[PDB]
Design a protein around this nucleic acid. Structure first.
Lengths: 117, 121, 98
DNA sequence: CAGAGGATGTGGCTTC
DNA sequence: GAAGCCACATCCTCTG
């Protein structure tokens, strides 16, 4: 699969596409990479951040770190971001202490996935 | 590396951190599809356990918190009635109405851990 | 609400309950909210006539109705061959707040 | 076979 | 007026 930067350069995640439909089987499932050696078993949740509806509804939002690569069976975005607006989704790693990498302009969550208008 | 070399600099340079350095509008994000009564109990029982999910409404930034290294200075329900008082992007950093499940909060650079963590290199 | 301007099912379906001349294809079943389904595929046909959807059948119209469940518009009378009922105590929370 | 249901395109209609 | 909604359309699937 293909990766992208984060706001924490210790972790990276999937290229979640520009604009997608409210609650779809993602076109590429969500990989989250541990460069810093993480105990393969640690939990990773995500929280969709946006000035509008600050905590959107998500599904299979929790995942397990395994071989330094936490994968989400199939994450799904339900709570819509709004017009032009995307999610600065937060990414938690359950450790002592836990760590987060913010991720601005992640994905635009509308009811239609971008049809040919 | 768990943290960035210029740990102090990033906090005092990044728009992301300084936008959260001031006292901002926060709210409880846990169990959004649940009645106001259930959300009130869940949030309180979780705070007592030393964990919750609060997000800066204004900016959009969500967080899952852990009030630890039960505690005292991390989760106090006495400082005021009807309310209660990590490594973010490689930067060591550190109230909600028990009825409304909303309130105010902010980030503060952790000089202590920033040294301890920087020393592990 | 946009039930006014653009044609619904439940808004359309009940053009045919209350009207005595369309009992050829349906009827109120009793004091409580319930309704029969005379011709299962003449029903769908006219809903095609309105929607401009000639492909329409029961299977199609039906699905649309089975959505209503999770939203609390209407519900099924279990086992009865093509008989559901309207939840009005909810249509007014779905057409007005609290 | 009806009946509940995920997935995904569709078309009319408010909102920026 | 594309960009978000909306409330079916059309679909192929199970499972009683």
């Amino acid at each position: 699969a293909e990766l992208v930067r984060t706001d924490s350069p210790n972790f990276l995640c999937s290229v979640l596409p520009s604009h997608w439909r409210c609650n779809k089987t993602l076109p590429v499932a969500f990989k989250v990479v541990a460069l810093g050696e993480v105990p393969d078993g640690t939990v990773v949740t995500v929280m969709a951040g946006n000035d509008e509806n600050y905590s959107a509804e998500l599904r299979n939002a929790s995942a397990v770190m395994k071989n330094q690569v936490a994968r989400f069976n199939d994450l799904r975005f339900v709570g819509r971001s709004g017009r032009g607006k995307s999610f600065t989704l937060t990414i938690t790693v359950f450790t002592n202490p836990p760590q987060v990498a913010t991720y601005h302009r992640a994905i635009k969550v509308t009811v239609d996935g971008p049809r040919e208008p | 590396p768990r943290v960035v070399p210029d740990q102090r600099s990033k906090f005092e340079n990044e728009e992301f951190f300084r936008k959260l350095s001031r006292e901002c509008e926060i709210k409880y994000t846990g169990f959004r599809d649940r009645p106001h009564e259930e959300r009130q109990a869940r949030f309180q029982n979780a705070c007592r356990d030393g964990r919750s999910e609060i997000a800066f409404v204004a900016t959009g930034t969500n967080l899952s918190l852990q009030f630890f290294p039960p505690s005292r200075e991390y989760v106090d329900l006495e400082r005021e009635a009807g309310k209660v008082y990590m490594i973010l992007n490689g930067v060591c950093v550190i109230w909600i109405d028990l009825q409304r499940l909303d309130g105010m909060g902010c980030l503060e650079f952790d000089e202590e851990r920033a040294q301890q963590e920087d020393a592990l290199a | 609400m946009p039930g006014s301007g653009q044609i619904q099912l439940w808004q359309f379906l009940l053009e045919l309950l209350s009207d005595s001349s369309n009992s050829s294809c349906i009827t109120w079943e009793g004091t409580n909210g319930e309704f029969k389904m005379t011709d299962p595929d003449e029903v769908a046909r006219r809903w095609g006539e309105r929607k401009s959807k000639p492909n329409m059948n029961y299977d199609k119209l039906s699905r649309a109705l089975r959505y209503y469940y999770d939203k609390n518009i209407m519900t099924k009378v279990h086992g009865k061959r093509y008989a559901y009922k309207f939840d009005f105590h909810g249509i007014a929370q779905a057409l007005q707040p609290h």
